[PDB]
């Protein structure tokens, strides 16, 4: 099998690790910076962070549950290995 | 107070929402694409996704608990409000 393939969606590692540091840095500096301005910005910031947080979460939850069922059926129909 | 401010770290919304769709898209296409190549790429992909997932998760957990304690102390010393 192809152990090395032309994976173009592997960009995910860049995206996720950078966003981990970028966004968590933003979070921490934002919660630090909030003391300078009106809390509405923090409300919005926290709303957006949490909105998207629950979004990715939910998306993969839904996908994962689907995958669990789909791949279970598929695996038991093909051959279920280990 | 300043309701509108020169928040430059507000890029976080772009970052998180794009990565939400980008990375979840990558995940789904990757788990779909994996059948074309060796599962090691999926192992690596899932390892990276989950690594970083638990990383940002943990970081903000750590920060959040610190924030809880720090801000508790601060708020009770300044004047805690609602």
């Amino acid at each position: 099998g192809s152990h090395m393939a032309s994976s173009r969606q592997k960009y995910a590692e860049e995206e996720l690790e950078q966003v981990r540091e970028a966004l968590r840095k933003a979070e921490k500096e934002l919660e630090s910076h909030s003391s300078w301005y009106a809390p509405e910005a923090l409300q919005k910031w926290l709303q957006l962070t949490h909105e998207v947080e629950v979004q990715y979460y939910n998306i993969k939850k839904q996908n994962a549950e689907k995958q669990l069922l789909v791949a279970k059926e598929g695996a038991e129909k093909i051959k279920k290995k280990r | 107070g300043s309701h509108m401010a020169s928040s430059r770290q507000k890029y976080a919304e772009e970052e998180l929402e794009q990565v939400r769709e980008a990375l979840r898209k990558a995940e789904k296409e990757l788990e779909s694409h994996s059948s074309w190549y060796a599962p090691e790429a999926l192992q690596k992909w899932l390892q990276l996704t989950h690594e970083v997932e638990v990383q940002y998760y943990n970081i903000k957990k750590q920060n959040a608990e610190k924030q809880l304690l720090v801000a508790k102390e601060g708020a009770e010393k300044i004047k805690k409000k609602r």
């Binding site: 993969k60 994962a64 669990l68 | 998760y57």
Partner: peptide, 23 residues
């Protein structure tokens, strides 16, 4: 193991169980 962790493992194993590729 947290919700994401457990489902990571479960779904990853399941996905490859069907879509392993080089099975």
């Amino acid at each position: 193991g947290s919700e994401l962790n457990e489902l990571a493992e479960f779904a990853r194993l399941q996905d490859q169980l069907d879509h392993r590729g080089d099975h």
